[PDB]
Design an enzyme around this catalytic site. Structure first.
Site, PDB file in Angstrom:
ATOM      1  CD  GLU A   1      -3.043  -0.681   2.390  1.00 10.46           C
ATOM      2  OE1 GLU A   1      -4.114  -1.324   2.436  1.00 10.46           O
ATOM      3  OE2 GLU A   1      -2.690   0.107   3.293  1.00 10.46           O
TER       4      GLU A   1
ATOM      5  CG  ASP B   1      -4.263   8.146   7.665  1.00  9.93           C
ATOM      6  OD1 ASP B   1      -4.478   8.809   6.631  1.00  9.93           O
ATOM      7  OD2 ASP B   1      -4.122   6.907   7.676  1.00  9.93           O
TER       8      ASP B   1
END
Length: 241
Positions: free
Chosen positions: A36, A47
Site C-alpha cells: 500500500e 489517519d
C-alpha cells in the site's frame, strides 16, 4: 488480490524522499504479499498520529503528486508485487478521476483506495475504475453496520480494508468476525499491529492479509534514509522468522 496469510506493508510516498521510498519498497518486497503506497495529503483527518506525521514530513520535503507514479514505475522494473495506491479524494478529484486512474494504471498500479470518497460518487468511481482496469479497495471501520459491509463488498474488486477507529481492541476483532461472515472478497486489516502475536492472532481469526503501516512509518520517521535495515528486521520479527 494477494496470497492468504500475506503481510502488506504501508509506506507514505516521499517520506523522507521519493528515492528512499523506492529503496524501502525494494527491500521489503521479498516479504510482501502486496504493498500500500500512500499519497501525502495536507489534511489526513482519517489517519492516526503516526501516519499523519509521515504525510507532513513528505509534504515538507517537497513531495509532488506525480512522483508517486515515478516510484511505482521504477518499482515495476524490478517487481510484479501488487501495488495499491492509497489517497484522499482532493488530489484525484482536482486532477480528474479518469485522468488520475488512467495514469495510475499506466504506471503499473493494480488497485486504488480513496479514503474519503463521497458516498454519492462511489458508483461513478467504481464504473470508471473498472473501465480503466483498476481494482477497487474500500475501507470499513468498527461503526460500519453489516448492511453497509455487504454493499461495500459488492462494489469491491480488489479487497476490503478493515481499519480501527483511530492491544488490538475487541471492537476491531468484532469488525473482522462480522466481515468474514459477509464478504466474498478477501479482507486485509490495518489495526495498528506492532508485535508478532498480533499477526498470529489476526490470521487465526480469519484475516486474509495483515497491513503493517504505523510500525514501519515510525521507524522511518526515526531513522530517515537509513531506515532500510531496521524495516527488514521489523517485518522479520512480525513474520516470526
Amino acid at each position: 488480490m494477494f496470497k492468504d496469510g500475506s503481510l502488506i506493508p504501508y509506506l507514505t510516498a516521499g517520506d523522507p524522499d521519493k528515492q528512499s521510498t523506492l529503496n524501502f519498497l525494494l527491500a521489503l518486497d521479498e516479504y510482501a504479499g502486496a504493498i500500500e503506497l500512500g499519497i501525502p495529503f495536507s489534511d489526513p483527518i482519517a489517519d492516526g498520529k503516526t501516519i499523519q506525521e509521515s504525510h507532513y514530513r513528505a509534504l515538507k520535503n517537497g513531495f509532488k503528486l506525480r512522483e508517486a507514479f515515478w516510484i511505482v514505475k521504477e518499482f515495476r522494473r524490478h517487481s510484479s508485487t501488487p501495488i495499491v495506491l492509497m489517497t484522499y479524494y482532493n488530489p484525484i478529484y482536482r486532477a480528474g478521476v479518469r485522468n488520475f486512474l488512467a495514469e495510475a494504471k499506466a504506471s503499473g498500479v493494480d488497485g486504488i483506495l480513496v479514503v474519503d470518497l463521497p458516498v454519492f460518487h462511489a458508483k461513478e468511481f467504481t464504473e470508471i475504475a473498472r473501465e480503466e482496469g483498476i481494482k477497487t479497495v474500500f475501507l470499513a471501520a468498527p461503526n460500519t453496520p453489516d448492511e453497509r459491509l455487504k454493499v461495500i463488498d459488492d462494489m469491491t474488486t480488489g479487497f476490503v480494508y478493515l481499519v480501527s477507529l483511530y492491544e488490538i481492541p475487541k471492537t476491531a476483532y468484532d469488525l473482522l468476525r462480522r466481515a468474514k461472515r459477509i464478504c466474498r472478497n478477501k479482507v486485509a486489516v490495518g489495526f495498528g499491529v506492532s508485535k508478532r502475536e498480533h499477526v498470529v492472532s489476526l490470521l487465526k481469526e480469519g484475516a486474509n492479509g495483515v497491513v503493517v503501516g504505523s510500525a514501519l512509518v515510525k521507524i522511518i520517521g526515526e531513522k530517515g534514509r537509513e531506515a532500510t535495515e531496521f524495516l527488514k528486521k521489523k517485518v522479520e520479527e512480525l513474520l516470526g522468522i
